[PDB]
Amino acid sequence: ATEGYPFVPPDWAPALFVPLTGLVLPAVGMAWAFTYIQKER
Amino acid sequence: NWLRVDPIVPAISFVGWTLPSNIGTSALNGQSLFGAFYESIGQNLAHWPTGPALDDKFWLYMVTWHTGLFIVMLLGQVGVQGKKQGYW
Amino acid sequence: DIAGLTPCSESKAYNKLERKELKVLDKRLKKYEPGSAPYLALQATKERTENRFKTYAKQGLLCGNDGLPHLISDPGLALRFNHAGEVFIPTFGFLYVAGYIGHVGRQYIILSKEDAKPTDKEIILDVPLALKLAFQGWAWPLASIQELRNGSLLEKDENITVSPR
Amino acid sequence: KPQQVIQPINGDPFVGMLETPVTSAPIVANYLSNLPAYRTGVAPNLRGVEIGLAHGFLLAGPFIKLGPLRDVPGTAEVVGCMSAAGLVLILALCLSLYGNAAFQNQPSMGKKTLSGRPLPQDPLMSEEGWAKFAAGFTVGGLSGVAWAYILTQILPYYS
Amino acid sequence: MKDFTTYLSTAPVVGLGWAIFTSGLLIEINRFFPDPLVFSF
Amino acid sequence: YGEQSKYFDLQDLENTTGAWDLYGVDEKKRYPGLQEEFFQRATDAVSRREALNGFVALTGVASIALFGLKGASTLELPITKGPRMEKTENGKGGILRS
Amino acid sequence: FEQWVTDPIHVRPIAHAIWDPHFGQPAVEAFTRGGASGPVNIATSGVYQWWYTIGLRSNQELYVSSVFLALVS
Amino acid sequence: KVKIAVDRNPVETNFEKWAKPGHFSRALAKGPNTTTWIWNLHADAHDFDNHTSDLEEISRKVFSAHFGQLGIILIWLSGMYFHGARFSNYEGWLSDPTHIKPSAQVVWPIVGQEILNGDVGGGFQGIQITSGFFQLWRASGITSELQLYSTAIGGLVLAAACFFAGWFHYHKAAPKLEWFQNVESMLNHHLAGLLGLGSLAWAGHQIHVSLPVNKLLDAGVDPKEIPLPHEFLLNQSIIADLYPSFSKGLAPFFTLNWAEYSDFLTFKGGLNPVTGGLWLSDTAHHHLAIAVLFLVAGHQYRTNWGIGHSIKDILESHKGPFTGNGHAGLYEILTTSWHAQLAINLALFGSLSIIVAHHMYAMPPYPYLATDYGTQLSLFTHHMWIGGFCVVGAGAHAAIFMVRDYDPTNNYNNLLDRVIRHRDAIISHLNWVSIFLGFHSFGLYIHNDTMSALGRPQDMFSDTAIQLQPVFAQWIQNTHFTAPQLTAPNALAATSLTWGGDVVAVGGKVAMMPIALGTSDFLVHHIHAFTIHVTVLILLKGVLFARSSRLIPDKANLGFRFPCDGPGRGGTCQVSAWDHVFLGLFWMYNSLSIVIFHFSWKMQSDVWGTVTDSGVSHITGGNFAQSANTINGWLRDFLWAQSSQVIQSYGSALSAYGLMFLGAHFVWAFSLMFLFSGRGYWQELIESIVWAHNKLRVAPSIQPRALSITQGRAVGVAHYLLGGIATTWSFFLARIIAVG
């Protein structure tokens, strides 16, 4: 993009990025942490 | 575990027939409390898609008659089992 | 006229506050007959208000931008200007009584400790010795100074319970 | 003849339960023993199919009826169903996580049904058995969500 | 009298006598004299 | 166990500790026989916990990415619709910024 | 930031856009402050005044600053 | 069998035990070595169980303790009557109750307090009272201050008699244990005698005294020319014109012609439109029927003449198969434990005080009480809080009985033992219903707050949006409104105007108007049910786990009020039942605070107000149906829309309420030291202060010690409760005085 070439933001960037980091990222964090704390030995 | 718990005996279903004979056709106000209940369930069946409203008198007769019934079957069960066990 | 505070005798907001208080006090006066006892109480309240406003003025008191009198706390400034009556003389006035209570409590503690089971004396007070010490505590700073020099006031820490850190 | 209805389980006053008519009723015992989660001889995936079907059929209802788009006609019945499917997927993920967590070890002590006769091991109490159970749960939940969806399309009454 | 005045000498009564004395003293000072602010004699 | 008063024997400690399945039966294949293999083949590709955790995550991240990008603005969610004309000015005590 | 540079006393700073799917239709409209189109949040951190004071004018320079600080992180 | 067993002169009357303050406890009889001796002295002062193990001396002690409390209450009542006789405007208030605010406390002009002598009208200045004593003195026919003086002097005489009675019945003639154990005689004498005789005496006083005075008062006759009640009592001619049935002269009573008494023993539903209170004829027939019901119920038990009922037989005969032994030993417990009877009596007293508050807010039984919004609000809130306190104390003393007086010998398979047996099931089910009620009440509130905040009011739980209509309460309202039509045909109108169709108003202000119930009332009522279920969970868990628990099996041997069993098992802090009561006090405080907030908001928004020609305008804008569904709506439209008069009360008659408000804020905030903190830090700080006092030789002989952990918790809960109660008291009274 013009004058915004580092880390170019599309118009659908918030509408796509917000649900992964509020939905998918906490889910992966929860599952990874739950497998961590429940790991035996 | 002695599956006779809450003993299902048809003798205590007879006491459920005395209350429609006692409350019903016993004059008092109007015709009877059970008679008024019969009239109420009669007119309530006309509006099948809907139900009784807040201003309707059906709930009063229904609740009073049903607590009277529950009281009489509870007391009949208690008496008829205290007779058998020795509790009187 | 220090720190930008006008004297209370020549302050417009002080007189406006006095007029406002007289107005609301006289507002309640119209609801009672003049020969009634609430009228006499309201009249006495108004007289006490007027006497307080008069006595607060012409006494060196000053105020600034609020109509409420201010107090000068710095010694010297309250001595060169006539403001020692605000806090300078009440300072020694309180300290005399504060040292009075501390001295009579100390003498009662010392007198009770040289007695069998002294813990009972704290919950079972004795009247003649406490009242004698109460009336023998006017010269508290004179007793405090003489005990300070000779070690009877203080105690060396070799008989004082100290923390084990 | 006192009719001591309230008694401890197996005549044992030392453990948690006491045999009570909420528990000792033949109708309640027969209904609970015939529930899929207590059919020990049946494979855990066949357990999960019925359990997920029932739970995914029930979970669609509140989402359609009280969803944010409930006032929009025609679209509430699809939004509620896909949100129910997402909830079923979340519950399947948590079920798989529980299967990983609770069956990393091996149980050594049996269940001991009344008057003895215990089977070797419940396949539900195993790792791969609970994984199959969660697989049956998510398949049943998805099929139940789709069934509640098509029941909201063809209808003689309401939704 | 001795048996009663021993009870009279305990702390709750002393908790009143000092309280009554000091309270009444301050009431009479605030009553006969008006409300002052400055100790200018 | 439970002869006249005893509740412990140390050789059938499965009965001693109180481990009892109050509701447990061992009746196998209660559903009809043709019904199992339709669902047994349904589970076998997702029976492994690795296949199931991946599939839930596969339907998870894809549908989450579908929402907002394609999921929003088709349901007319009130986040990607835009304003008409509201809230340009702010400040009731004056100053009137923006 | 450009609108703040043109008029600091009038235009308000903006921190980040608000994409909350649980927002209602009045909620989206009532948060387009600072002369924006979408729902945005008014910045009170003071970085607008600081960056206008140190000579940052265009958002290209802020983009270069962001990528440089990400590189140094 | 029942007789009067009395021991004469067991205790000498002397100040020997007054000389030594620590004499009831052998641990405190040594001396005050530490500063905790004083707190143990004032704490174990009335704990008569550890003073001695003899039940007879404990019974004598509590008998004279009740005598002393009765004398104290009689002194207080005599003082209130004297205040109404001397410093009051009761004569002015009688001639004008709708325009002159009641006042019975007169302050001194000593230091600026003359602003507190508010202009209450009638040429009188003083503190505007809120107890409603003027309404009571108008119901019970009282005209002049001479009668109030006589009542005050009689109350002082009876208080002196009660104190002398306590001294006599302890020091001079103390009853034995068998005298106190005559439970059947006690019940018969306090059913037929106390309650029945008092009800009959009050009915007679209302019929012969209060009815003519109240009949002449609402007719416009000035009280100066109203005849004194002794003229009505002696002369049948004066009482005959006001009530024609008195011309018969007790003929219909003995000839069974009670229908002729339908003029002054009426059965009317509603309130008197002239005054706003209940009809005095209705109250006369009410108290007469209550006297009848208590005279017949007071002859039930068997004491000395064969006939009657034996309570042990009644308890042991009611045995049902799911309960095993049915009420088998409870007669033995309740005849030997003072704390069990204390728990029962305190629980029933607290619940009945709650009923008293609800049924005074519902039907005002006093003339010019409904329009006096301050008296009604104060009575409701005060009896609300007293009932809550009595219930919490009932739980506390039940736990004390559990710890001390409970023994396993008499109870094997009875109801108490089986309640002990399945206590975990009860606690778990109560926790489940606790979580369920908490979620679908408070989460509903939070969801409504969120949908309001998200700009979606159509997704809220309100009347405009999807609603939770309280159909059962509205059906009960409709049934009670239509109850005089069919089920009670002899009633003139509905028993209360909560569910009526008409609005009564005295002096241009609404006395009582019909109350509409919506989604907000549903939410607040289920919030109340949740909060009460939590508090009863805490109290019942404290009672049940006081003896033993899975954590601490030997909690019985550790006493009732102990701080902890140490940091073992992860820390067993607050494990005692005393700490359970300590938490239940706060939960009570939250419950009753929300209850009285609901009462004040609902009554100010839908009942209280000033009637106009063009409809009825309430105190608020009728915003309870629109703002009580959200927490922010509750806050802004109740605690912020009101309390604007408390902050601006300065310089006015109600500035003392603002001072009390801020002092209550201080005490409520000061309590959190004793709540959050512990003892070791405070003990070390006290050690440093002790070193400071040791340096210059002012060391006290009594060692200064920090407060005990139970002592610190008690101080914290006491300061917290006092601050919260005074906060709500000041806010409620200032709002209802400056507006109502």
Ligand code: CLA
């Ligand atoms: C008369 C006895 C007496 C004396 C001489 C002292 C002296 C002292 N105390 Mg102590 N104190 C006392 C009683 C006394 N205290 C009592 C009864 C309490 C409990 C309330 C305390 C609580 C206390 C604390 C918590 C602290 C001190 C501190 C101090 C020091 C600061 C001076 C001061 O005013 O403290 C302020 C003192 C108080 C606020 C306590 C006021 C209580 C009243 C006035 C005492 C009543 C005593 C009684 C009238 C005597 C009986 C008279 C006799 C004829 C019967 C000083 C060493 C401070 C310190 O360590 O400084 C280094 C400190 O932190 N004291």
Ligand code: CLA
């Ligand atoms: C019909 C007879 C009668 C009456 C009226 C009462 C009345 C009362 N009893 Mg009871 N009592 C009775 C018989 C009676 N008793 C018998 C037979 C026994 C033995 C089994 C007891 C044993 C007993 C105990 C153990 C206790 C009471 C208590 C009380 C008081 C409870 C306080 C209350 O509720 O507020 C009502 C308050 C009032 C009405 C205030 C007026 C009080 C007047 C002066 C009492 C007059 C009633 C009296 C019986 C008259 C004869 C006494 C005579 C020697 C002077 C109340 C006054 C409690 C107590 O100690 O209080 C005294 C208590 O704990 N009672």
Ligand code: CLA
């Ligand atoms: C029918 C009424 C009644 C009776 C006869 C008793 C009798 C008893 N209770 Mg119970 N109790 C009651 C009501 C009653 N209580 C209520 C309503 C509560 C709830 C608050 C409690 C809570 C309670 C607990 C938690 C405990 C008792 C205990 C006791 C015993 C000793 C009490 C004692 O020595 O206090 C001594 C008296 C005091 C400490 C004075 C009270 C001062 C309070 C804390 C502050 C009052 C402030 C006041 C309201 C406003 C003043 C403001 C201030 C600025 C001046 C005794 C068996 C204790 C026990 O060991 O039982 C065997 C015990 O642990 N009770």
Ligand code: CLA
């Ligand atoms: C207002 C203050 C407050 C609140 C909210 C709580 C909350 C709680 N206390 Mg407590 N309590 C407090 C102060 C408070 N406490 C204080 C000061 C004391 C000291 C006296 C106590 C004493 C006390 C005792 C003695 C007991 C409790 C219990 C409870 C629980 C009751 C749960 C319930 O039924 O409600 C429902 C739940 C709530 C109200 C919590 C908020 C729920 C909101 C609406 C969120 C809804 C779901 C949400 C969307 C999920 C978020 C997901 C996110 C992670 C992504 C809960 C954990 C009791 C308990 O353990 O449960 C039986 C209990 O026995 N508390």
Ligand SMILES: CC1=C(C/C=C(\C)CCC[C@H](C)CCC[C@H](C)CCCC(C)C)C(=O)c2ccccc2C1=O
């Ligand atoms: C502050 C505090 C203390 C310290 C408090 C103590 C030692 C009590 C102090 C009581 C005082 C001495 C009562 C008297 C108060 C004033 C002296 C009264 C003044 C009256 C005027 C007229 C002078 C504890 O000991 C404690 C223990 C456990 C939990 C929390 C706490 C806690 O929070």
Ligand code: SF4
């Ligand atoms: S912090 Fe206090 S109450 Fe808790 S275990 Fe320790 S000593 Fe006991």
